[PDB]
Amino acid sequence: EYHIDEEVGFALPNPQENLPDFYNDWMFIAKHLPDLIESGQLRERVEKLNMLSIDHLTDHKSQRLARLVLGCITMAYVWGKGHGDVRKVLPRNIAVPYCQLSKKLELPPILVYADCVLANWKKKDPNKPLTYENMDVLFSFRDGDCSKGFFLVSLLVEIAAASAIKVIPTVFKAMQMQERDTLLKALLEIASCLEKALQVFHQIHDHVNPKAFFSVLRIYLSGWKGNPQLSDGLVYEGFWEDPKEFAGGSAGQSSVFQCFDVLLGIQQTAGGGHAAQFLQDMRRYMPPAHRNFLCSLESNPSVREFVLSKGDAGLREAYDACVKALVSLRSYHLQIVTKYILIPASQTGGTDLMNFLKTVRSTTEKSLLKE
Numbered sequence: 001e002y003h004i005d006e007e008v009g010f011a012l013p014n015p016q017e018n019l020p021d022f023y024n025d026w027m028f029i030a031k032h033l034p035d036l037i038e039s040g041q042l043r044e045r046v047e048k049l050n051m052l053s054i055d056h057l058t059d060h061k062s063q064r065l066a067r068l069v070l071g072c073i074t075m076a077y078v079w080g081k082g083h084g085d086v087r088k089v090l091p092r093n094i095a096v097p098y099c100q101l102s103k104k105l106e107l108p109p110i111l112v113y114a115d116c117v118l119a120n121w122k123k124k125d126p127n128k129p130l131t132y133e134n135m136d137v138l139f140s141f142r143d144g145d146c147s148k149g150f151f152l153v154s155l156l157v158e159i160a161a162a163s164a165i166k167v168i169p170t171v172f173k174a175m176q177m178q179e180r181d182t183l184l185k186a187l188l189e190i191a192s193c194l195e196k197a198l199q200v201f202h203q204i205h206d207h208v209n210p211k212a213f214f215s216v217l218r219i220y221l222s223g224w225k226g227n228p229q230l231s232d233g234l235v236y237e238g239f240w241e242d243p244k245e246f247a248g249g250s251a252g253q254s255s256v257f258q259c260f261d262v263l264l265g266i267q268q269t270a271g272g273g274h275a276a277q278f279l280q281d282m283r284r285y286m287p288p289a290h291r292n293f294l295c296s297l298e299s300n301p302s303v304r305e306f307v308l309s310k311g312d313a314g315l316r317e318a319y320d321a322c323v324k325a326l327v328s329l330r331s332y333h334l335q336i337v338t339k340y341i342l343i344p345a346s347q348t349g350g351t352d353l354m355n356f357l358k359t360v361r362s363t364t365e366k367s368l369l370k371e
């Protein structure tokens, strides 16, 4: 019911690679975005389409692949070549089906993390394991944007977190059964798997270039909420009356970090600050099943209060290890932002952005029991 895989966690277990033949006009545009943008034929070829209906998309993986295809097409149409020439209105041939599809999956009509990472992958050899060399994305925007490296490294962090996520039922089951040793073991295991996820994060340096990321890829993943280039928003023609605002694709849209914040009693979304508000808004951009999972974790008894009541140095230490793993992940993530956003931007927007991430990191570090 929560749609969480044992192996790949929040990611889609094995994404559908082909659409039905009825939507071959969509798939051809999405498969050839690098050429169609560079040549300048994308906007024209989207302009002259047919309003294809949603009813032939039968199952969930088909509907998700359609969201990814239509999402990638919508980014490249709006942002064009990505040198400031923008379209303020999305044609009703593409906008109506995309909006009707998006209402069915309870997601906004914009490319989200669930599309371009969680559903945008495949294994080359099905009989080999989930490593970077054996994997590839389904869609990219331009040549030399490093879509593969960025989406797959994000995906591999989701996969690393799946080892911790599958232990969560043991944590709550151990608390109700009043089983101290099982709980201690489950927390050390979660801490161990979140420590492993940090090493997976290191691969970002191997497969993504700062200048390629900042110049090319960042422009296509940006949205139309609080954006000067579309201050009113994007007009979805033939569906909504006025231009609607929707935030761009981010890995703040991931459920991984929020999952373990809620599990460990770290009250990020508590208070009325910008950090709390941002993280609560990012839930709207997650699949409904994953929102329901985060709701379910909030509804359960507090792991934090359970551990604090027992006067047990082993349980406190194990709970701290989980918290420390999250702090370390966010601490490393700040370094990435310095390398991949701050330095390229230089060669108070940068200051506020780092203070956001540091507020979230500080809220995490405040939850430690020893310090």
Ligand code: HEM
Binding pocket: 153, 154, 157, 158, 204, 208, 213, 250, 251, 252, 253, 254, 256, 257, 258, 330, 333, 336, 337, 340, 341, 353, 357, 360, 361
């Ligand atoms: C080049 C790589 C990366 C850059 C430049 C980057 C940049 C950022 C920025 C600027 C934010 C602030 C929110 C926003 O304005 O959208 C953010 C938030 C976030 N990023 Fe990344 N990021 C990168 C890679 C990753 C990866 C691989 C993950 C893996 C899951 C990740 C997870 C997050 C999360 C969870 C947040 C939400 C804030 C939090 O919970 O601490 N990011 N990122």
Ligand SMILES: NS(=O)(=O)NCCNc1nonc1/C(=N/O)Nc1ccc(F)c(Br)c1
Binding pocket: 112, 113, 116, 117, 150, 151, 154, 217, 218, 221, 222, 248, 249, 250, 251, 252, 353
């Ligand atoms: N204008 S801004 O400050 O750069 N805001 C956007 C920042 N976030 C990002 N920009 O570019 N990738 C980002 C990001 N950060 O965690 N994660 C991310 C990871 C995988 C994806 F498929 C997508 Br889509 C986003």
